[PDB]
From a paper:
A key resistance mechanism involves the addition of 4-amino-4-deoxy-L-arabinose (L-Ara4N) to lipid A, mediated by the bifunctional enzyme ArnA. Subsequently, UDP-L-Ara4N is formylated in an N-formyltetrahydrofolate-dependent reaction catalyzed by the formyltransferase domain (ArnA_TF) of ArnA, forming UDP-L-Ara4FN. Crystallographic studies revealed that full-length ArnA assembles into a homohexamer.
We therefore optimized specimen preparation by employing graphene-coated grids, which mitigated preferred orientation and enabled the collection of a larger dataset of particles. This approach enabled the determination of the apo-ArnA structure at an overall resolution of 2.89 Å, with markedly improved map quality compared to the initial reconstruction. The hexameric core is stabilized by extensive hydrogen-bonding and salt-bridge networks among the six DH domains, which are arranged symmetrically in the center with threefold rotational symmetry. The six TF domains are arranged radially around this core, each tethered to its cognate DH domain via a flexible linker. Taken together, these observations suggest that the flexible interdomain linker (residues 304–314) provides the structural basis for the observed heterogeneity and serves as a molecular hinge, enabling interdomain motion and coordinating the movements of the TF domain within the hexameric scaffold. In contrast to these arrangements, our structural analysis supports a DH-driven assembly mechanism in which three DH-mediated dimers form first (A1–A2, B1–B2, C1–C2), followed by association of these three dimers into the hexamer, i.e., a trimer of DH-mediated dimers. In contrast, alanine substitution of Arg472 in the DH–DH interface (R472A) caused a significant decrease in activity, and the triple mutant ArnA(E407A_E411A_R472A) was nearly inactive. In our cryo-EM structure, we observed substantial chain-to-chain variability in the angle between the DH and TF domains within each monomer (hereafter θ).
Numbering used by the authors:
A (entry chain D), B (entry chain C): 1 to 656
C (entry chain F): 331 to 656
D (entry chain B): 441 to 550
The structure:
Amino acid sequence: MKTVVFAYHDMGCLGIEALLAAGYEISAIFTHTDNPGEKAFYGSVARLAAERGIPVYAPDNVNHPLWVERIAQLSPDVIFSFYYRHLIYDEILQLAPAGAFNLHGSLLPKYRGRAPLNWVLVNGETETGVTLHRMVKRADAGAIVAQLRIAIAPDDIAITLHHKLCHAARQLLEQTLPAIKHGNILEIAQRENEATCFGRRTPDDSFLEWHKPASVLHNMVRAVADPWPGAFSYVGNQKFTVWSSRVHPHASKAQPGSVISVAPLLIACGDGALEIVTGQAGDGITMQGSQLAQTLGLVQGSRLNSQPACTARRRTRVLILGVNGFIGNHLTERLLREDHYEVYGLDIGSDAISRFLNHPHFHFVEGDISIHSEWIEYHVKKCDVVLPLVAIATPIEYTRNPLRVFELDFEENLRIIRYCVKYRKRIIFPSTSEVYGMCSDKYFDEDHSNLIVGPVNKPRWIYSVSKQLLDRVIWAYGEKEGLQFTLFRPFNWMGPRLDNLNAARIGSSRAITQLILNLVEGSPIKLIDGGKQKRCFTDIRDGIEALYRIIENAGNRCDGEIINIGNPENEASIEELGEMLLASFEKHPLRHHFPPFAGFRVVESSSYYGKGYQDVEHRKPSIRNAHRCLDWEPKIDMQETIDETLDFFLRTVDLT
Amino acid sequence: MKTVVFAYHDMGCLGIEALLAAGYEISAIFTHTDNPGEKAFYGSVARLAAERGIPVYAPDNVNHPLWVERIAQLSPDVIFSFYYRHLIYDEILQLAPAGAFNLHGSLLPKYRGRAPLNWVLVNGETETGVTLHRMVKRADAGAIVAQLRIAIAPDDIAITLHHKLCHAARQLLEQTLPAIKHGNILEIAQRENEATCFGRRTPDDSFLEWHKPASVLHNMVRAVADPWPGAFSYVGNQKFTVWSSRVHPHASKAQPGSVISVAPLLIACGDGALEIVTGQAGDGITMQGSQLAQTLGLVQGSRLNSQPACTARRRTRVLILGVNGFIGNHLTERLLREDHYEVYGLDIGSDAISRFLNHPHFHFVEGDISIHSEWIEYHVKKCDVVLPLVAIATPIEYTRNPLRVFELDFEENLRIIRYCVKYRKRIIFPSTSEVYGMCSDKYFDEDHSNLIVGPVNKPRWIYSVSKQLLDRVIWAYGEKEGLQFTLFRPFNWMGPRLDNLNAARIGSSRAITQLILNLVEGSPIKLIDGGKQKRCFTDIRDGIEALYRIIENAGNRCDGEIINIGNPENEASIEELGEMLLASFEKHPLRHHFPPFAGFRVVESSSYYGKGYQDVEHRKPSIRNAHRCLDWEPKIDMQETIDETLDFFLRTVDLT
Amino acid sequence: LTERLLREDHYEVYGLDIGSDAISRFLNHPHFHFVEGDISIHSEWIEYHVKKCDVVLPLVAIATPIEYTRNPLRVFELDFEENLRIIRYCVKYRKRIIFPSTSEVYGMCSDKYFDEDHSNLIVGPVNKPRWIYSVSKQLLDRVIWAYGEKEGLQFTLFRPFNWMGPRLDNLNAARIGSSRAITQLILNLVEGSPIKLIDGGKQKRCFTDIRDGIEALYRIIENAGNRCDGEIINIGNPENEASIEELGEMLLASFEKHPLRHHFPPFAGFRVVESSSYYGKGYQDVEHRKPSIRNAHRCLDWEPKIDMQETIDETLDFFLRTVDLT
Amino acid sequence: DKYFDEDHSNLIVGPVNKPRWIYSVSKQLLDRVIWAYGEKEGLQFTLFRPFNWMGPRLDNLNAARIGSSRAITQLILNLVEGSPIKLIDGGKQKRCFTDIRDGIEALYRI
């Protein structure tokens, strides 16, 4: 009596009708909200089910343990599924403790993804059918119960196909239910020995390249025929779609280029001859080929290029606003190793970018974010990617002048962001790792962590709250006004361009400079017992690689994300008491090389352990969106970073 | 080739199937893509015709004189129509001696309106049908040939009834094609003269009223049944669509809102009782009443918020720039006579709107479009409809100094236009009748006439070109950035409160004012050698009614449109105008007003006109988009307008 | 606050607002000077009257709970940009500002008692578009503090904790603002409906009568001995804690005393015990809402006096007597 | 007009719904504001109309469709690619071309 059915389309509707005729009460149906606008040529299942009285639930929190307990309490005995999200779910894979039956309409276990029947028709196969198998913990690890073979008629039409599908469904439902119910499944094993990936299911968008065989073109044109999105191509300033063609006897000795008939439209290809019956003018309806053939006026000898090269991918012009900064220069020296990239910048110097003088693609104006507002106004109109990598906030500055962390680090950025919304550009806004403040979470996740700041009377959380509100108004702009954006959070990046030189008296600014002075100046301070702090550092190379992948945006899958770019696994307790420095102090020169002394007085002098100025827990990030939207994972460890930094810093002071 | 067909919708598709099956060779069908056609069914026509290789045509815009000439030059004798809306019938049908045949889907001629299915189903009749009829000099007054009878049942649903109607129509066509081919139709004289006009169907009046009987509710629920969006109210914070009902004892004594039983959900009403089995919450899932009731945390007994439906009516705010002018102060007196209108305003004076300053919703703020630009920016952001009725373009002004007509009538209007494109607001921009210039068309068409101007050395065409380019900028903004607009062209609006220069631009010529001023004293009515100027005038009442209909946008029929508001059939020369003016001036009193001695019979004086050497003879508006989009036709004749203007001038002269 | 100021002689009020619906009693006062308008196009008026007056109160707060999730650009541009503009008029002309902060700056603060000098402010991740209001107001307070530290700006910040009383209709409460606890319950009371349709005593929702809060704000305005400048004062009732069910019970008990004509019949309605798919889905946030009056009891010498029963009677009297069918 | 006179010929354009005349009108209002400026502000100007200037070193092949619709460029493309020239209506339509070296000697004289 207890049975769960996920039904869809006409076969699902008739299955529901048959089950009600037999009188089995479906336990529960879990479906999602219907899309507002879609080609709904089928009937409305939800309304019919409501008339039948079957309850419908919409789980807001499928991750919730409560709903899992509910599903367990329901005691799922027998579940049938009919094209419901193909392999039901992916992340959980636990909803089938006793197993379930999945009916698929493709050649399992290969051809993974969406629209499987269309894709197997793309390759031009003459064999289809249905595959039933048990649902276990490992995906596609159930033996095929039965697999019938139905021939694909060369002249098959849609109505005959519908009648054949109905006949097959009737044959299945009439007297095959007892066979499945009895338990004649002989599952032993499946695959698990080859595991050979053919092509990793390359999308290849929908470009109609003529180099591709004409047979494949006919196949996917029929596959994407009505009702489906269909092929959509555009050459020059004119777009065209191939909506309907009929196969014709392909010639071998055809003498391509000799058009003997323009009506109907017949052009030559790499192999064979395709006869396109009807197509659509894009901004209209289906039209006969002969009229378009007469309208275009093409004559023998005219060759259609395989790629229009009208807009192509242009240049992907990138606009940086901190191009002389650490990240600003390390990203400029990486974007210029490619070909499809233009770079800009308006920092207040060119000391770290003197290397780039007259490369094919680079520009430099050397202005100010406040004074030079028209240049930025026009350059968030010409470019397509904006990286406001500019910020003037010394840790001291929150006490010297807290209003400089607002009028410059919040309002200039706010003005820049309002440029990307009035021109509909993309902005990769650099957030900070201080937004979380003193979050107690072990892993500073970017999606479900609580940003904790101090009281209003502490004049040091204005930077963190300013950046947090900047991210919030970026998110609101993105989700209300159609702003493509991507926040990214650097996590203690360390490269050999950290603070240039100490000309600006940055020695007493922060301990990050005392680390530099540790190796050169005589500093008898090495006996720190870790400080109970997990100093997670990341090399600049990995961060720049991640930022490059963010800029690439492979398939528009980095939009509206808050990726953190760090190395949560590369921790270092006080540089391992100088272990690698013991191996790297030998180098080559002997000047200034003297063995250090020893001694330890107090931990208090080194670091501050106050109430207001304290980061509770540690600073280890959580890279989850980085591993998905970039498929990126850190490779460089602390040793190479330390030696490279020391070597570069030694070379940047020459001799004296 | 004969018998071209205007078909559309699924009935049109099946009629195409029928004519193809019968062997009747029709080579031309008319259909419209209909972008606002977001119905669940795509309703695509001629697909099978395209697949069969039949050469068909797809003419989108029939009213273009090119298509008219092509469809007229072959001179056919039969034009078939099958559920083709957008009638706007014209001379093309009158050309054919045999006329045209149109198939209406209701029992003509009683209560035809628009969407006649609602009209026939609201009255709870027991028999409906279709009617193939002729075309006449009137609108939708074709003779009935036969009356189909298949009857209706309360249990019968929309799907079954529509399928039966489709099959019956198929058989009817298949058996009557010989009948129409051989004619012998016996149409009887119809009673079209004694009919009912001036009434339409609007969804806005379909609110749920408890006092209506259960019969009317049952009727309009079945009328809007599936497949259709549904007729729903707007209660506080819960959506529901009436899908199904069950006949229950019509004796609920309790007041509306009381739930008699929760399984199934049955509510009480003022009369009868509706049983809502299921409801659709907006765009999600059509789900049952009980589960929805338990989902929203409401219990049995929860009454509804009486007659107020949440927030009914919002009082759309109209931002009129130039309220003290001739059109601004006549429109305000018209918008303030109704509800749901919260008029705003800004001009340099309030001498003519002095009667609205104490109105609950007038909000007049004195200012100038230049100095007070932030006020305009804010009020274009808060309001909904913007009417820039500011004119500083006296002919003397833009001839003596065209730089002002540029910096004021192009650069100030362009700013207001660009306010509505960033705040996404509707703008009804007043164009001018001067755009056509020296056009050589009898009727100045809004979509087909050419705009002719003189050479650049003539600075008298700068105003016309400036306004024409202003229309081309608005048109390009609603085609590239989605801007809702409606250009209207005042064609010689005449009425009271027409000052000398204050209404010489947005109003009309000073003719009537000149003769009245010369008539209050003994000055003559001296004519001109070209006294037969043949000037057509429009009453301010008719123009304001048309502009109010434009503001309403009843069914989004005025969107992206250009409408001339004029009276082309109100032609009158200066002599006739003077005759009627004198006749109305003598009237009953005949006293004071000075002796009206006037008249001259030579008045040659050779010539004294320098810029009068060129004059236009074609100045007739083509009012068809007005009677296609707002269904407006001028009513007031010239004598009434003359009398009203004279009476206003004589009572408001304020003399002794 | 205007009616409290216009009874104590030496006070010249200058009010700006879009309408005079609830202040019709003061336009005939010799020292009221009301002006009709909105703060988007009155920049000159506001600037001139900041330069002219001595104390400035930007009580203009347009923050609907729905507006937190709907088009929060409006929330940011009206509750942060105009407030920022007004704050910078008070540093140009060296004027005092009494800024209304919000009790929502603490957010999910774990502390039982919300201290304004020691407690932490906790907010959710950036993806949830509901905390933009709290962060905007917190940044406004931090900017005011920075201005009163670097520019010598005389300021005071006050945080209201669920003030209730007569005339609470404006745009938050009342029929128009149906998204509210008290007004929805009282509307369900007025019209015969199943009152107390809840499945158990909810969190203790403390309320403060408007009279005590207005007294505290008046003492802030007085600035006796200048011991209130440079402070953040919490104005609330940490002792008037009451659950929703207890509130309904006491309101019904007060109704029982002189129930007019017994023309409003209360009712009850049963609901599914399981309450599957309901409001509670992880929005517990905090369960205390306890303010700290330790700052209002040291700077204002203020201690709340009016208890819950008098507040309920006052609000009910106003609601049932001032309005009628229209 | 048979001959496009610079001070007597009338300028005719299509309706607003035809968006191809927005370039003719934009450049026609620019000549009417230069004329207006030269009458009330004493601006020294000269408005030259190059009709069909054609010559060597024209626009290079770019991201658009062979630069622009230039008629002659289509013919050169057909000659280079060996495409037969489509004789539409047998070449009845004429075109009056001007050499760049001839119109440049007039621009320099201006």
